[PDB]
Amino acid sequence: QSRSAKAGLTFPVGRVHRLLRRGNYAQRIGSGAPVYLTAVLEYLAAEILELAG
DNA sequence: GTGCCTGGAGACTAGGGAGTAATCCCCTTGGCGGTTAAAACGCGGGGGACAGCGCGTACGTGCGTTTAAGCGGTGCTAGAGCTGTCTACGACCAATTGAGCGGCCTCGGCACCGGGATTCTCGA
Numbered sequence: 001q002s003r004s005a006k007a008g009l010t011f012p013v014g015r016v017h018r019l020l021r022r023g024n025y026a027q028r029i030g031s032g033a034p035v036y037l038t039a040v041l042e043y044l045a046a047e048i049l050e051l052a053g
Numbered sequence: 054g055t056g057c058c059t060g061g062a063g064a065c066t067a068g069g070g071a072g073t074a075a076t077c078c079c080c081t082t083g084g085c086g087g088t089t090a091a092a093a094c095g096c097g098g099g100g101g102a103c104a105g106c107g108c109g110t111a112c113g114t115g116c117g118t119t120t121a122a123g124c125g126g127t128g129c130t131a132g133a134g135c136t137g138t139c140t141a142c143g144a145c146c147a148a149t150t151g152a153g154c155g156g157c158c159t160c161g162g163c164a165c166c167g168g169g170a171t172t173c174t175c176g177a
Contacts, residue, residue, distance in 0.1 A: 002062055014061050028070080 007035055011042045 004012040017034040020026075 004061075012061090018060075 003035075007038070009035075009038055009042055011038045011045070013038050016041075 002014075003017075004014055007013075013034045016037050017029070020029060020034070
């Protein structure tokens with residue numbers, strides 16, 4: 001399974017990893033940080049979508 | 054529904070951060086006395102918060118009128134991408150030097166301390 005769906009989530013991981021890789025935010029990057037961004041933004045999106053419903 | 058272009062996924066090899074030994078070690082947290090300037094209790098008050106009245110006016114509301122102004126068309130016009138093509142163009146590791154920090158020593162106005170001249174009391 002790809003990294004965008006290995007954790008069973010909704011938001012893509014490769015998209016935010018490509019955004020930080022060329023956005024020049026650090027020298028290196030840990031493996032847990034893009035999926036952590038994935039989890040935080042998908043939880044914020046799900047909460048505001050439940051409130052929108 | 055249907056679909057082709059392309060970022061996404063991923064293992065192997067150099068190559069630079071992580072937290073666990075290690076040890077100073079400086080800052081801090083905790084308490085004892087004192088003494089003192091600030092915090093607290095109270096008491097009369099008077100000056101400022103607050104209710105009410107006079108009023109008048111100017112906006113709440115309504116009506117004739119203009120007044121741009123909105124919806125729809127379409128050419129005129131001139132500003133936004135994208136692929137070639139070439140030039141600059143800022144970084145990589147290394148010898149040499151440098152210039153601002155670690156810790157040291159010198160001035161200098163401010164506050165405290167003593168004499169010269171002046172004024173006050175008594176004595177001669």
